[PDB]
Amino acid sequence: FRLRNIPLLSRVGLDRADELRSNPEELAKGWAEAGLITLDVRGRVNIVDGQVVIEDAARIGDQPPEHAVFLGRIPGGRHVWAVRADLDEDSAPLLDLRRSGQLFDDTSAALLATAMAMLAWHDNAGYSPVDGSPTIPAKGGWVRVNSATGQEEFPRTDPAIICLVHDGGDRAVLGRQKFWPERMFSLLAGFVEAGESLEACVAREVAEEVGLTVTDVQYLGSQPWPFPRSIMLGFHAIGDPSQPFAFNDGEIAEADWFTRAEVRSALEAGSDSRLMLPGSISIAREIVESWAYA
Amino acid sequence: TFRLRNIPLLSRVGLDRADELRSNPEELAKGWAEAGLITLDVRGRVNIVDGQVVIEDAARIGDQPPEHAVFLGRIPGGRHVWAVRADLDEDSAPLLDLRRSGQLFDDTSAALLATAMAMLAWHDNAGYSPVDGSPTIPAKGGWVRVNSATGQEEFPRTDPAIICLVHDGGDRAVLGRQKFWPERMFSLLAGFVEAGESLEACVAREVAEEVGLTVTDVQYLGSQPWPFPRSIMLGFHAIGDPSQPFAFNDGEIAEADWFTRAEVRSALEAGDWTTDSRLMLPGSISIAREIVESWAYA
Ligand SMILES: Nc1ncnc2c1ncn2[C@@H]1O[C@H](COP(=O)(O)O)[C@@H](O)[C@H]1O
Ligand SMILES: Nc1ncnc2c1ncn2[C@@H]1O[C@H](COP(=O)(O)O)[C@@H](O)[C@H]1O
Ligand SMILES: [Ca+2]
Ligand SMILES: [Ca+2]
Ligand SMILES: [Ca+2]
Ligand SMILES: [Ca+2]
Ligand SMILES: [Ca+2]
Ligand SMILES: [Ca+2]
Ligand SMILES: [Ca+2]
Ligand SMILES: [Ca+2]
Ligand SMILES: [Ca+2]
Ligand SMILES: [Ca+2]
Ligand SMILES: [Ca+2]
Ligand SMILES: [Ca+2]
Ligand SMILES: [Ca+2]
Incomplete structure (x- = not known):
């Protein structure tokens, strides 16, 4: 037998725009009218009309912060990023994407899966396993550079x-x-x-x-x-x-x-x-x- | 359309990894008397004999299993087998690396060496928690490293x-x-x-x-x-x-x-690329x- 349906979260992804991760300038230029997704400590997120909440991004800074993660572009060409943050209790937050992710469209679910795994990784990769040194995010958040040696650490799946x-x-x-x-x-x-x-x-x-x-x-x-x-x-x-x-x-x-x-x-x-x-x-x-x- | 004709090299057999024993210091120590030992240099190279990885008598490095070693499982017969990192003489005997010479090994030996090679390399790259920075200490036949401060386990990465x-x-x-x-x-x-x-x-x-x-x-x-x-x-x-x-x-x-x-x-x-x-x-x-x-x- 074969699977009848493509499992949730697997239905292709977005334009992750690998190109731009190693191009600080282009990231900065598109940040003006960029989108921002926000996840709490437990990986909870907000939803509206079956879709992830995408803020206007400039409303946390002039420039993209180091703790953020660049997720790519959405139909139209607009950048979209993700940050860890507290969430407003006066909204509709989902305790577990695991148990509620069927409420989202495929795109939103992709965004969230990416954002969620990356942010969790950052939170668990502030030090090199090799020597012990602090590490520093870079390249739209897709690597962490060892502070002593300059050696890259990559997302772990x-x-x-x-x-x-x-x-x-x-x-x-x-x-x-x-x-x-x-x-x-x-x-x-x-x-x-x-x-x-x-x-x-x-x-x-x-x-x-x-x-x-x-x-x-x-x-x-x-x-x-x-x-x-x-x-x-x-x-x-x-x-x-x-x-x-x-x-x-x-x-x-x-x-x-x-x-x-x-x-x-x-x-x-x-x-x-x-x-x-x-x-x-x-x-x-x-x-x-x-x-x-x- | 199609399926693979052959099982790819390095997949052709699974070891008896003897999961049971990893969390059982005593049983490890009892079988160590007549255990086997494989030895890899820093580059993952080993010695081979008649197409087979060299398995020393294991007691000739210890009374007991050292901390830096990694327990690979059992071989047909029920004999334990471990792996250690060690310097080896480039000049006294030919050193083979799996990457360019894996076809010369029998299936079992190739499995042992692939396991041993990835694990030892991992140990060398996981002496500190990625989470906090603390030293880490091997345990359970080398299959985990325990954070020294928190006691939290770190696991091999593939x-x-x-x-x-x-x-x-x-x-x-x-x-x-x-x-x-x-x-x-x-x-x-x-x-x-x-x-x-x-x-x-x-x-x-x-x-x-x-x-x-x-x-x-x-x-x-x-x-x-x-x-x-x-x-x-x-x-x-x-x-x-x-x-x-x-x-x-x-x-x-x-x-x-x-x-x-x-x-x-x-x-x-x-x-292929070599010819x-x-x-x-x-x-x-x-x-x-x-x-x-x-x-x-x-
Ligand atoms: N877990 C990973 N380990 C190594 N390289 C990775 C990993 N995840 C992504 N990469 C990317 O793979 C490329 C490295 O190519 P290579 O030299 O063949 O390892 C770079 O573009 C990395 O950003
Ligand atoms: N590579 C790994 N990453 C994370 N946890 C692991 C790993 N290998 C073993 N474990 C631990 O082993 C438990 C159960 O082992 P398993 O039978 O492999 O699912 C998990 O709940 C983890 O705590
Ligand atoms: Ca029954
Ligand atoms: Ca592309
Ligand atoms: Ca590639
Ligand atoms: Ca890639
Ligand atoms: Ca690529
Ligand atoms: Ca409020
Ligand atoms: Ca599991
Ligand atoms: Ca399990
Ligand atoms: Ca199990
Ligand atoms: Ca297991
Ligand atoms: Ca078993
Ligand atoms: Ca020589
Ligand atoms: Ca590759």
């Missing part, structure tokens, strides 16, 4: 796999983590280690978490996941129900095989039956859904 | 990069030459994944930047660890349109054209060569 193990027919593995509300299962996920391919990572993470041996590992799609800095790569793989479970790396409290039937009805639910699926914008939902209605 | 074959849906495909390569040397289009984009959007973005084409039907082919120093390469193909002219916007690309399967097959047979004619293909151990090859022979 950790790849993670998320997998649906199925039997090749009508059944599929879902699992629940230690502290999750009961009756709540989802796909198996794990970070890619150094020295392994995605395919090997899937097989490894599945074996660790539920003790199955899988084959026929196939990619379904991908999704930026700024919480704070993942990119999720979706897979499916064939397991064997006869092989018993085993919770070695005990991140998984409970797991079972579920029927297509069970999953379809669990998808419709969202306090009745034994399986319930958490309701987010995740590619996880799109994978489960694309399998269950093959 | 940067994803895409590499793409743009084809017309039939018999032609885009290849390009970077300004900083020799003059008859072409390959696929590549790029790092930026924050806030999916792989598919990255492919479309990087293709548009480098050669100014608009692509659709972006499909994954496979992946390959790329510890030079810390990438993972994700291979794709996409459909372009030959009638749309080229344009070298983000001028990393000096020249590019559409090539026939015929042309590419004969270019593959001539040689007459106007097209010659970089890629030996790269998934790039495997993608081009898998497309050109159907």
Whole structure:
């Protein structure tokens, strides 16, 4: 099977205008009538008519500040930037783009995903991992330069796999983590280690978490996941129900095989039956859904 | 259209990484008695014997496993195996680096070395928290570094990069030459994944930047660890349109054209970047060569 829909946040991006990042002058010239998006500490943002709030940008400075991040151009040719800031409690702020991002258009969601991962990175990359030195933003916020050595540090996106193990027919593995509300299962996920391919990572993470041996590992799609800095790569793989479970790396409290039937009805639910699926914008939902209605 | 014919080098086997033991100091110490040791110089080079990475008896550097070492897992039989950085004599024995000699290694050895190489390099570049600045200390068989002030864990970094074959849906495909390569040397289009984009959007973005084409039907082919120093390469193909002219916007690309399967097959047979004619293909151990090859022979 294949994914039915492109997952939220993946539907192409903007004109990120790589060119201009290394061109301080052009940034300054376009800043006059630039746009500004603003994110609080928790990554919350404002929305209006299904669209991200874009202030007039000049109303915080003459020039673009160092702590800002240049996001690109929007249809028409107008620059757009992002800053970390407090937000006004007297607006409509979204606590989690993760749980509410379906309210936004594709463009706005792209802006926000970019802005959110970058700002979070800045907040976690003020020092070189190499020596310890302070670091300084540059190039529209797309690098941080070591203050001692001049060496560039770049935005960090950790790849993670998320997998649906199925039997090749009508059944599929879902699992629940230690502290999750009961009756709540989802796909198996794990970070890619150094020295392994995605395919090997899937097989490894599945074996660790539920003790199955899988084959026929196939990619379904991908999704930026700024919480704070993942990119999720979706897979499916064939397991064997006869092989018993085993919770070695005990991140998984409970797991079972579920029927297509069970999953379809669990998808419709969202306090009745034994399986319930958490309701987010995740590619996880799109994978489960694309399998269950093959 | 197509799938990869071969599993790309460095992906051909997974180790028994023995996740269990990393958080179990005792079991590490018990198996260290008859453990194996791989040793890498600063440049990631190692010694090999009969196409296999050299695994010393491990006790000959310690009573116990040192802090700077990295636990790689088990080998068939159940024997532990570790890796350390050390200076090695350039002159007493040949030192091989995976980048140019990975084809000479067996699959297991190549996996071990790729893991060991990316991890040790990471340690050398993660002695301080990026967050605050504090020293950091290896732990859990070297798979984390703990901040000394806060106790917060830092983890190994792998940067994803895409590499793409743009084809017309039939018999032609885009290849390009970077300004900083020799003059008859072409390959696929590549790029790092930026924050806030999916792989598919990255492919479309990087293709548009480098050669100014608009692509659709972006499909994954496979992946390959790329510890030079810390990438993972994700291979794709996409459909372009030959009638749309080229344009070298983000001028990393000096020249590019559409090539026939015929042309590419004969270019593959001539040689790669290391080895007459106007097209010659970089890629030996790269998934790039495997993608081009898998497309050109159907
Ligand atoms: N995580 C990253 N590591 C290295 N280079 C990166 C990364 N993310 C983006 N880049 C860009 O990749 C280019 C470096 O090319 P290269 O010399 O092949 O590493 C520059 O334009 C960087 O801004
Ligand atoms: N590369 C990584 N980046 C961030 N956290 C990681 C990484 N590798 C392992 N972890 C930690 O390991 C936990 C679960 O491991 P996993 O089974 O790989 O999902 C995560 O919640 C993280 O705290
Ligand atoms: Ca551009
Ligand atoms: Ca107010
Ligand atoms: Ca997990
Ligand atoms: Ca995860
Ligand atoms: Ca793991
Ligand atoms: Ca295990
Ligand atoms: Ca795990
Ligand atoms: Ca059952
Ligand atoms: Ca010499
Ligand atoms: Ca590039
Ligand atoms: Ca690259
Ligand atoms: Ca890039
Ligand atoms: Ca680029």
